Short mmCIF file of C-alpha atoms and ligand atoms in Angstrom, two decimals:
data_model
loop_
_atom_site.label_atom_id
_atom_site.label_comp_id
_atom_site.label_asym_id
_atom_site.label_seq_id
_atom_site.Cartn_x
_atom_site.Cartn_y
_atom_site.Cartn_z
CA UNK A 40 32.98 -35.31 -65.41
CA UNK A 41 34.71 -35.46 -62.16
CA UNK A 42 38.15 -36.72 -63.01
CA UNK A 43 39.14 -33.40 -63.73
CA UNK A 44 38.35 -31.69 -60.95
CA UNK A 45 40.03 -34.44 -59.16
CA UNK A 46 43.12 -33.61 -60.29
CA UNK A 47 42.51 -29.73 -60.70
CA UNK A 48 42.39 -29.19 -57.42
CA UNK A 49 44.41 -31.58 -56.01
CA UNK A 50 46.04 -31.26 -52.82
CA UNK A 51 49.13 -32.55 -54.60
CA UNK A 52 50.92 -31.10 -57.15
CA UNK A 53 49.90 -32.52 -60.90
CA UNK A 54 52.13 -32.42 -64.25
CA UNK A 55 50.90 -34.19 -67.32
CA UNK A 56 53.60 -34.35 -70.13
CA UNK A 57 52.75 -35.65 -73.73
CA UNK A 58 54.65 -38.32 -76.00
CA UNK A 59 56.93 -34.96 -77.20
CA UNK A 60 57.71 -34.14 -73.25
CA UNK A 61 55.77 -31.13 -73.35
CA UNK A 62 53.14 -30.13 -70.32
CA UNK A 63 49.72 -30.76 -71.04
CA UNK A 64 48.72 -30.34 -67.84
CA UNK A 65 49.73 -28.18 -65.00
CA UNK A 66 47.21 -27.81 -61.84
CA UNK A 67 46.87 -24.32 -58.86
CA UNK A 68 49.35 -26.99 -56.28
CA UNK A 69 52.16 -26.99 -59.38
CA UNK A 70 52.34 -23.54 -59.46
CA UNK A 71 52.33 -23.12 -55.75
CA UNK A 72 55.43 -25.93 -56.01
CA UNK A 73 57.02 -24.36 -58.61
CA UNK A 74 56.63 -20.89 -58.57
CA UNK A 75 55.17 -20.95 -62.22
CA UNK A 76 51.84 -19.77 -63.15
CA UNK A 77 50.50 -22.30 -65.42
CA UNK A 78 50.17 -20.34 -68.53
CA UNK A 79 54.03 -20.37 -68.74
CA UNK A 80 54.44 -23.76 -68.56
CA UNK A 81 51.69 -25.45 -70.80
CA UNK A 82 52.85 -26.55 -74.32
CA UNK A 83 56.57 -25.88 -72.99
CA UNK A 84 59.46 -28.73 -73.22
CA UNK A 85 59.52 -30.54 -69.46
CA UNK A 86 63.17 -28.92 -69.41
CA UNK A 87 61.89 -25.65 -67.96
CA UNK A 88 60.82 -27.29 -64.92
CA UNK A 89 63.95 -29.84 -64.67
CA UNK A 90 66.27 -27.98 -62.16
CA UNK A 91 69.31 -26.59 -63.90
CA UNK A 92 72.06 -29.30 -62.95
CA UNK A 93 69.85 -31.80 -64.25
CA UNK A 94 69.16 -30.64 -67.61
CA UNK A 95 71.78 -32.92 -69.44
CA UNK A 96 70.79 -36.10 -67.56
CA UNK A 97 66.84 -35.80 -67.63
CA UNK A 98 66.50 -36.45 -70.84
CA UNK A 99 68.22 -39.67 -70.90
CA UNK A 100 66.33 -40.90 -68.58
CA UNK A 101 62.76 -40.33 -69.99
CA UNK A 102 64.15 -41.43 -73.42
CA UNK A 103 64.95 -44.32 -71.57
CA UNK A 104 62.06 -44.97 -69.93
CA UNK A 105 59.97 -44.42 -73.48
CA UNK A 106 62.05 -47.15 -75.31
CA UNK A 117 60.78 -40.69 -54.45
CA UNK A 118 62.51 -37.51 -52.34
CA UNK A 119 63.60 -34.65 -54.97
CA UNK A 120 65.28 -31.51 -54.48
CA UNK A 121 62.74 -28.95 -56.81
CA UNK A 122 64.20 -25.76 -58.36
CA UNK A 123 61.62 -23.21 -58.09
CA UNK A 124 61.09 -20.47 -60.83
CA UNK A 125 63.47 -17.67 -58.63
CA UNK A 126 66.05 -20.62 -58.13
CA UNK A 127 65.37 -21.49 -55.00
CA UNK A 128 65.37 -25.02 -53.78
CA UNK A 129 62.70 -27.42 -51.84
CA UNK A 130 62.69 -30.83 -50.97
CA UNK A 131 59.46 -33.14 -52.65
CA UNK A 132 58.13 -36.52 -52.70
CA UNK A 133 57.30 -37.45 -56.44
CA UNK A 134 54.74 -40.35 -57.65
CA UNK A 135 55.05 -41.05 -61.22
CA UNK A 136 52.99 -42.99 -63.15
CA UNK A 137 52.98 -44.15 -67.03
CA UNK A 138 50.06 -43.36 -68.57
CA UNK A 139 49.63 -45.28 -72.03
CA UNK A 140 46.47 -43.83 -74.03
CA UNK A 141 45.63 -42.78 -77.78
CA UNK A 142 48.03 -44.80 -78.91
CA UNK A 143 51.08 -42.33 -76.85
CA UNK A 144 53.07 -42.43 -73.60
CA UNK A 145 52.13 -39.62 -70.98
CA UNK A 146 53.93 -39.19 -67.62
CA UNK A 147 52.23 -38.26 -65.07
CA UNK A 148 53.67 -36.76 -61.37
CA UNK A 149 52.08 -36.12 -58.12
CA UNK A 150 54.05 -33.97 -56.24
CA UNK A 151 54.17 -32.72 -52.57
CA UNK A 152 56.31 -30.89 -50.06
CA UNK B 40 39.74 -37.29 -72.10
CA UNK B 41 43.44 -37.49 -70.58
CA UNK B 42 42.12 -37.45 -66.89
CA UNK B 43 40.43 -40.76 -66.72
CA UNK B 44 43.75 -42.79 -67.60
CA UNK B 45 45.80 -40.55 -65.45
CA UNK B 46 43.38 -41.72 -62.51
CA UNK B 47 42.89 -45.37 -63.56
CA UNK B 48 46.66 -46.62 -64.62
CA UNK B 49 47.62 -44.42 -61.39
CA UNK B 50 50.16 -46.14 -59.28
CA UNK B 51 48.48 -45.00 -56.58
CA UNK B 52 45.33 -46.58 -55.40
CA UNK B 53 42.64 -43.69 -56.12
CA UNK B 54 39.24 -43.93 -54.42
CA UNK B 55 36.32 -41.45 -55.15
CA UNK B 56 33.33 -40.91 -52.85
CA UNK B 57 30.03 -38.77 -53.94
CA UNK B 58 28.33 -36.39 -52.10
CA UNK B 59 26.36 -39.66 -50.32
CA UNK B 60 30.00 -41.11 -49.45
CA UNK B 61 29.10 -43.67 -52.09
CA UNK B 62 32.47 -45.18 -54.17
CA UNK B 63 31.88 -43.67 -57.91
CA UNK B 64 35.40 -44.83 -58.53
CA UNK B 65 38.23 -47.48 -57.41
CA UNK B 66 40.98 -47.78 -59.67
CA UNK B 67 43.20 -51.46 -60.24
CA UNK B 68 46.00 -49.81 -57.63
CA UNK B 69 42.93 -49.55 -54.85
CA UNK B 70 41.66 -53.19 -55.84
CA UNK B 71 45.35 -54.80 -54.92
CA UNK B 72 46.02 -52.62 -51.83
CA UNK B 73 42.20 -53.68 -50.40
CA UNK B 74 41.95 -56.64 -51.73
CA UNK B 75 38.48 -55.86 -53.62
CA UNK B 76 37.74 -55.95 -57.58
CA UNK B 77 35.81 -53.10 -58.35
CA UNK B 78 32.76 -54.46 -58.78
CA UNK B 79 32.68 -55.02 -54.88
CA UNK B 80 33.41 -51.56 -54.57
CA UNK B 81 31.68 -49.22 -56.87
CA UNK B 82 28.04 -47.94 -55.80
CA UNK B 83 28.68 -49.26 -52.12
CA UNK B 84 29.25 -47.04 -49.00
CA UNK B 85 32.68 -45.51 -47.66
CA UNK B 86 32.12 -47.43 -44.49
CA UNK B 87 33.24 -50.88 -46.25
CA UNK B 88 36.01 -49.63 -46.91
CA UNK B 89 37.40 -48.80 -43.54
CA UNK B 90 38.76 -51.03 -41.11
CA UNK B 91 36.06 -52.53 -38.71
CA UNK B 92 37.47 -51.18 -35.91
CA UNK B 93 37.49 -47.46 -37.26
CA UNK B 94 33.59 -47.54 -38.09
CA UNK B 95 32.00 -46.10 -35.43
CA UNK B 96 34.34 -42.67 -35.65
CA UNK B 97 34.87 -42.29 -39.37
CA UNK B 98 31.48 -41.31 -40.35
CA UNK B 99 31.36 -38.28 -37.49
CA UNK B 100 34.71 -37.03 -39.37
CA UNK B 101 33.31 -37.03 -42.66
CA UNK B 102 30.32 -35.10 -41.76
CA UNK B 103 32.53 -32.88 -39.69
CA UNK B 104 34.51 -31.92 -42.75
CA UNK B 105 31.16 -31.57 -44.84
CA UNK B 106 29.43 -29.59 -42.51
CA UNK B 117 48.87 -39.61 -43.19
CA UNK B 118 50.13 -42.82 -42.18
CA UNK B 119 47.23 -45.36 -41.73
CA UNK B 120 46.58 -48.70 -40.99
CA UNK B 121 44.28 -50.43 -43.91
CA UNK B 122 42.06 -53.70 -43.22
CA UNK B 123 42.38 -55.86 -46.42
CA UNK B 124 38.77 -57.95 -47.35
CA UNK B 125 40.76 -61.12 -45.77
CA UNK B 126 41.26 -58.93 -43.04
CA UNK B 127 45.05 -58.96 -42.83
CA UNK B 128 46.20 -55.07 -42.02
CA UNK B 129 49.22 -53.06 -44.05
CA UNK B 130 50.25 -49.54 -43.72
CA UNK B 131 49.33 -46.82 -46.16
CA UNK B 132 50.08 -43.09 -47.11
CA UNK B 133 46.89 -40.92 -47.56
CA UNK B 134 46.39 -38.27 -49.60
CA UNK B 135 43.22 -36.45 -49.30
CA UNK B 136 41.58 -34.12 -51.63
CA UNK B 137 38.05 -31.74 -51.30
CA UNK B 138 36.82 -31.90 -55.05
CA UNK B 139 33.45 -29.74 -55.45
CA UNK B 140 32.07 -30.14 -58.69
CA UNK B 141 28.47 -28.66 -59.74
CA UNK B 142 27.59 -27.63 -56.34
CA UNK B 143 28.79 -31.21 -54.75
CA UNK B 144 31.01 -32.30 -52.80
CA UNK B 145 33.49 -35.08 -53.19
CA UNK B 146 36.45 -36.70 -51.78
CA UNK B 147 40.05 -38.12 -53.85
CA UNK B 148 41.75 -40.50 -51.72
CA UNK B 149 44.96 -41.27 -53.23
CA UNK B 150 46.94 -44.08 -51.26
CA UNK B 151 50.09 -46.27 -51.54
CA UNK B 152 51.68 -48.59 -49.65
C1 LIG C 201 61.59 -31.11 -59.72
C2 LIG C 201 61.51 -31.75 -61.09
C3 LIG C 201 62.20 -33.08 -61.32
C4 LIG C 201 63.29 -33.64 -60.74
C5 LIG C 201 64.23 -33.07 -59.68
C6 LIG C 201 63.46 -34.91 -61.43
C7 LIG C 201 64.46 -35.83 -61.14
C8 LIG C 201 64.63 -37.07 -61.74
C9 LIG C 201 65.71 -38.00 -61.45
C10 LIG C 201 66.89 -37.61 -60.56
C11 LIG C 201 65.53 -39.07 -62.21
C12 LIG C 201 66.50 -40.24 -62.44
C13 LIG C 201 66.06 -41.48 -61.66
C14 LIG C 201 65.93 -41.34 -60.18
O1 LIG C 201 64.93 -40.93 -59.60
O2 LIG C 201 67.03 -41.75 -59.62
C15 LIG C 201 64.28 -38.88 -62.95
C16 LIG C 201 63.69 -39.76 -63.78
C17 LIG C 201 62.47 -39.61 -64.41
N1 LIG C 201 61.71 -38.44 -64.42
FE1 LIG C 201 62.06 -36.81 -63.37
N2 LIG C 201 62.39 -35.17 -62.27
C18 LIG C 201 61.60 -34.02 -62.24
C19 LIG C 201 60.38 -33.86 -62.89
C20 LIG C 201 59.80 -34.84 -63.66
C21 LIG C 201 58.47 -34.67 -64.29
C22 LIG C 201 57.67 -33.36 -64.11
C23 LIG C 201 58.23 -35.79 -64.96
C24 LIG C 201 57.06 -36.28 -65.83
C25 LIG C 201 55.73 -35.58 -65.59
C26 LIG C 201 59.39 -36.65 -64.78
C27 LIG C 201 59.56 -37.86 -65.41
C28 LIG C 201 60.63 -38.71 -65.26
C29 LIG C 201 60.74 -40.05 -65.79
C30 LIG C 201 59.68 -40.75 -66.65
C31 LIG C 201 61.93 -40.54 -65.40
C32 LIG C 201 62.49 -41.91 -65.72
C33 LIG C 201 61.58 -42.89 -64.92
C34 LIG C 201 62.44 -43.91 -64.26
O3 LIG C 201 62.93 -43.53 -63.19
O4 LIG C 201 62.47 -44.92 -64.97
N3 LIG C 201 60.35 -36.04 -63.99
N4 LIG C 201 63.75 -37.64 -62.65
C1 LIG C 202 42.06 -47.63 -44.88
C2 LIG C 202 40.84 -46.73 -44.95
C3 LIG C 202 40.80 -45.49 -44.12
C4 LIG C 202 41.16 -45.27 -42.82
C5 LIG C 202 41.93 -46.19 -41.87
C6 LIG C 202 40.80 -43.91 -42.54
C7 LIG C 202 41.02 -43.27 -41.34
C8 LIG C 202 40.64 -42.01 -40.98
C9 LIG C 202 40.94 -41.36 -39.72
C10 LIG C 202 41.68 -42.01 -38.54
C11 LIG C 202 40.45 -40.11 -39.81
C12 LIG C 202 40.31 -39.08 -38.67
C13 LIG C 202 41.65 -38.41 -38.34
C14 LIG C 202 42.42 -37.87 -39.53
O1 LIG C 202 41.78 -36.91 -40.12
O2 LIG C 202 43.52 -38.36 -39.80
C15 LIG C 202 39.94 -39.90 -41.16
C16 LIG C 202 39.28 -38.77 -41.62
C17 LIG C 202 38.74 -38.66 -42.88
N1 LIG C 202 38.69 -39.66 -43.85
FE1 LIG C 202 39.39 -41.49 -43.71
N2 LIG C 202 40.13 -43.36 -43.60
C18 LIG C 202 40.13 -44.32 -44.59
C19 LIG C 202 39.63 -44.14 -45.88
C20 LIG C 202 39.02 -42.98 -46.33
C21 LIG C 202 38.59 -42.81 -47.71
C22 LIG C 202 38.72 -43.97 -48.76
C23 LIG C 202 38.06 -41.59 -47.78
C24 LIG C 202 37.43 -40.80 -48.95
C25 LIG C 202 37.75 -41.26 -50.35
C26 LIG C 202 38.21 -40.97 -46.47
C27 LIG C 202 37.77 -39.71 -46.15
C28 LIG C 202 38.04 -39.08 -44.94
C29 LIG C 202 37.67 -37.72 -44.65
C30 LIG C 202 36.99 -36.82 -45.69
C31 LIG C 202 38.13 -37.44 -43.40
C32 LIG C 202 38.05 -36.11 -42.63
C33 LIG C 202 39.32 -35.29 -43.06
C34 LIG C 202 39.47 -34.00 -42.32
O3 LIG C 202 38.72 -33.72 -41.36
O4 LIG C 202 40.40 -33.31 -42.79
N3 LIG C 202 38.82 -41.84 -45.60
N4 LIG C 202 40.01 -41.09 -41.84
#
């Protein structure tokens, strides 16, 4: 019972997405990153936290992926810089993502 | 559920200490950045997990916090530099810690 409290409350940033690229998962240091409380984001299309000008390219690249320093768009539109860990997470038969984020 | 795989097929070696600083958890990622299998690992003491030479402070800072670029010592005793990420996890009234490390 402790792995989810070790990701709940996280220093870093956590975002689960599911095999359809919505968020499953979405801890307190997200929103903080973000700017979005989580009950906006869970069961939403990744998209909504993709920042605008890469909207058309995103996709590709998780479709891609399926077959780091970041500029973050926060929920008012402004802009920080991040360090993102991803990691592949294969279980129940699907393909989760899962990223660790920090300022 | 979901948060055990997102732990153990991390990319980032995860390490999880109890309230008696034993290891409860050491993912594949820790095992190649120490140089331990789990089973070396799991149900032993912080302490062998920290470089020889950092032994006789560590535990003080650990009960300090009860009450960053590093330098790990591999089991063959050759040294590499890490990131760590450190995380406060209290869960049913305990306290433990999630390292999260990469090289
Ligand atoms: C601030 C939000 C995000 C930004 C700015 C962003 C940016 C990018 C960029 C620019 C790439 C193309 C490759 C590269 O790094 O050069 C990429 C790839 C990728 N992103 Fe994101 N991303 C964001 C959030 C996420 C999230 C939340 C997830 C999943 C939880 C994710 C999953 C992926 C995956 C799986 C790929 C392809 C992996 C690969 O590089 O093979 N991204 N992202
Ligand atoms: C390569 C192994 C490690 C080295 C070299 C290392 C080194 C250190 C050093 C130098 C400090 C004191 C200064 C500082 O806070 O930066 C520290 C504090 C601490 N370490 Fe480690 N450590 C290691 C592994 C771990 C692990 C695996 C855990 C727990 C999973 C851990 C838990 C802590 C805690 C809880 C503190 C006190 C943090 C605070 O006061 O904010 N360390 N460590």
């Amino acid at each position: 019972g402790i792995f989810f409290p070790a990701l709940e409350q996280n220093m870093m940033g956590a975002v689960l997405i599911n095999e359809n690229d919505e968020v499953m998962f979405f801890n307190p240091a997200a929103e903080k990153l973000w700017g979005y409380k989580r009950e906006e984001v869970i069961g939403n299309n990744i998209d909504m936290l993709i920042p605008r000008d890469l909207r058309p390219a995103h996709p590709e690249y998780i479709r891609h992926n399926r077959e780091r320093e970041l500029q973050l768009e926060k929920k008012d539109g402004s802009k920080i810089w991040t360090r993102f860990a991803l990691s592949k997470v294969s279980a129940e038969g699907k393909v989760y993502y899962l990223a660790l984020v920090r300022d």
